[PDB]
Amino acid sequence: MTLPAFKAYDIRGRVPDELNEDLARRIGVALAAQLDQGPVVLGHDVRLASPALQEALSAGLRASGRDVIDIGLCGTEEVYFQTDYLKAAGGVMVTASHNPMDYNGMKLVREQARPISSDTGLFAIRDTVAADTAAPGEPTASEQSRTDKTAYLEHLLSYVDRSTLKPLKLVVNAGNGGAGLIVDLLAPHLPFEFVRVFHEPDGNFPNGIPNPLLPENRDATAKAVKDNGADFGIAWDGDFDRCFFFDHTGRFIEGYYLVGLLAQAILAKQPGGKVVHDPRLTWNTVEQVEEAGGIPVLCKSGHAFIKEKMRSENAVYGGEMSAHHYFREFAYADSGMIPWLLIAELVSQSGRSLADLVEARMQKFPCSGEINFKVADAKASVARVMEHYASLSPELDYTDGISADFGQWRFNLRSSNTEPLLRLNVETRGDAALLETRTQEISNLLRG
């Protein structure tokens, strides 16, 4: 067989049978052979076992003659940022995301924080690690601790005109992940009043593994917003590359609508720019991008495809409905910090609430939200859906699974690249009834 921890986009598995210090050291050795010249940036999340896995990576990298830049406890975007900013050969973030307590993982990048994925180095690393029975060498290169976040913080603040910001009251919910550290470093430079929920980093996760999409976790932010009269709330996943927004009513804003909102915010600063979006939900983004004078660029989902499309297009911004937002100036990488700074600036400058910034868009392009299906036979299930709708002659697009545009409604149906699931998204042209009947119709076909 093959090592199960090696997935399409990253390394993820149970400790210690799928991932451990020995495997981590071998990954460091193997990564050294895959990179162009330079040092390697290493960072880690709040999970209890993450430092030891990072130390093992460092030992393997240094035995292979790579200098290591240890940026310490951080978010995933800090590994991206420092890898690019320091002109390093690559970087590794040790992060378990929202996998169980006995799980960990790694996200690996090369120069300019370009992703290393299954077909771009990750399976090559896997195959080297799998066959590597050599005795561990000793270090022939040094590790330096670089915990200065000044350049990173300055970069984040560069996205907004601080003199235009108003003293909004913002709920922030790190979920006991790492986001609060950055919020607190930014706060002296911002006028906002922060209401801090689940703020302290704690890899024991007394309030649940960080996952703002789970209703119990969602409700903690919503309650804080409502009880404190906050202008809006922001929650993050544990490594804070995903951000989640709650309006002043406590309502969670579906991530689809943040793509168009952020695109308009960015296009104000960079007129005429291209914006990359995924094929899951599209109509609102295309319209908002065009209305703001930008050019929308359809791309397959998944951060590696998005980033390379952005690079080839000089796109200023890209966004997925799955709470991933990519910024050209940020090494084409995703940040969970840039988006809420931009939204806070937009609320400050416009005088409009976050709710009102999205309300009409949500009415105009209502969507199902992503609905996941584990079925016995995904291919047969997709075929049943397509056969059922064939007589309507939808416009079909195969950029990522199947997108079918029927005129007043459309859907995207695709296999996930991170879980063995089918993912469905439906949207309509201002028609909530059609959305529900078509969503239920497709759901019945998929489960048939």
d(CA 405, CA 396): 7
- Is position 85 an interface residue for ligand G6P (rule: CB under 6 A)? no
Partner that binds at residue 237, options Ca ion, ligand G6P, none, CB closer than 5 to 8 Å by kind: Ca ion
d(CA 306, CA 332): 9
Which burial class, exposed, middle or buried, applies to 216 when counting CB atoms under 10 A from its CB (0-12, 13-18, 19+)? Answer: exposed
- Is position 9 an interface residue for ligand G6P (rule: CB under 6 A)? yes
Size of the site for ligand G6P (CB under 6 A): 12
Partner that binds at residue 401, options Ca ion, ligand G6P, none, CB closer than 5 to 8 Å by kind: none
- Is position 10 an interface residue for Ca ion (rule: CB under 5 A)? no
**Which residues in the 86-105 window bind Ca ion by CB under 5 A?**
97
Which single residue is written with the structure tokens 């929920």? 197
- Helix locations, 367-424, DSSP H: 378-389
Q: Which is nearer to Ca ion, 217 or 282 (CB)?
A: 217
- Is position 7 an interface residue for ligand G6P (rule: CB under 6 A)? no
Q: Which is nearer to ligand G6P, 190 or 306 (CB)?
A: 306
- Is position 418 an interface residue for ligand G6P (rule: CB under 6 A)? yes
d(CA 40, CA 62): 10
**Which residues in the 419-448 window bind ligand G6P by CB under 6 A?**
419, 423
- Is position 241 an interface residue for Ca ion (rule: CB under 5 A)? yes
**Which residues in the 155-194 window bind ligand G6P by CB under 6 A?**
none
Choose the catalytic residue: 50, 58, 64, 97: 97
CB-CB neighbours of 154 under 10 Å: 10
The helix (run of H) or strand (run of E) holding residue 47 is: none
Q: Which is nearer to ligand G6P, 9 or 389 (CB)?
A: 9
> Alpha carbon of 46 to those of 11, 30, 59, 235, 332: distances in Å?
17, 25, 20, 16, 25
Partner that binds at residue 416, options ligand G6P, Ca ion, none, CB closer than 5 to 8 Å by kind: ligand G6P
Q: Which is nearer to ligand G6P, 70 or 84 (CB)?
A: 84
With CB under 6 A as the contact rule, the residue among 112, 353, 416, 443 that binds ligand G6P is 416
**97 is a catalytic site residue:** yes
Pseudo-torsion of CA 160, 362, 316, 153, nearest 10°?
A: 30
Min CB(5)–Ca ion separation in Å:
17
Q: Which is nearer to ligand G6P, 180 or 302 (CB)?
A: 302
Q: Are strands 90-94 and 40-44 parallel, antiparallel or unpaired?
A: parallel
Q: Let me know: does 252 contact 218? Beta carbons within 8 Å.
A: yes
Partner that binds at residue 400, options Ca ion, ligand G6P, none, CB closer than 5 to 8 Å by kind: none
With CB under 5 A as the contact rule, the residue among 45, 231, 239, 278 that binds Ca ion is 239
d(CA 236, CA 245): 9
d(CA 298, CA 348): 30
Min CB(80)–ligand G6P separation in Å:
12
Partner that binds at residue 239, options ligand G6P, Ca ion, none, CB closer than 5 to 8 Å by kind: Ca ion
The helix (run of H) or strand (run of E) holding residue 79 is: helix 76-85
Q: Let me know: does 9 contact 115? Beta carbons within 8 Å.
A: yes
- Is position 99 an interface residue for ligand G6P (rule: CB under 6 A)? no
With CB under 6 A as the contact rule, the residue among 66, 324, 325, 410 that binds ligand G6P is 324
- Is position 78 an interface residue for Ca ion (rule: CB under 5 A)? no
Q: Let me know: does 205 contact 217? Beta carbons within 8 Å.
A: no
As given in the structure block, the two tokens for residue 75 are 């978010």
> Alpha carbon of 258 to those of 143, 332, 359: distances in Å?
40, 18, 12
Binding site for ligand G6P (CB under 6 A): 9, 301-303, 320, 322, 324, 416-419, 423
Catalytic residues: 97
> Which residues of the chain form contacts with Ca ion (CB under 5 A)?
97, 237, 239, 241-242
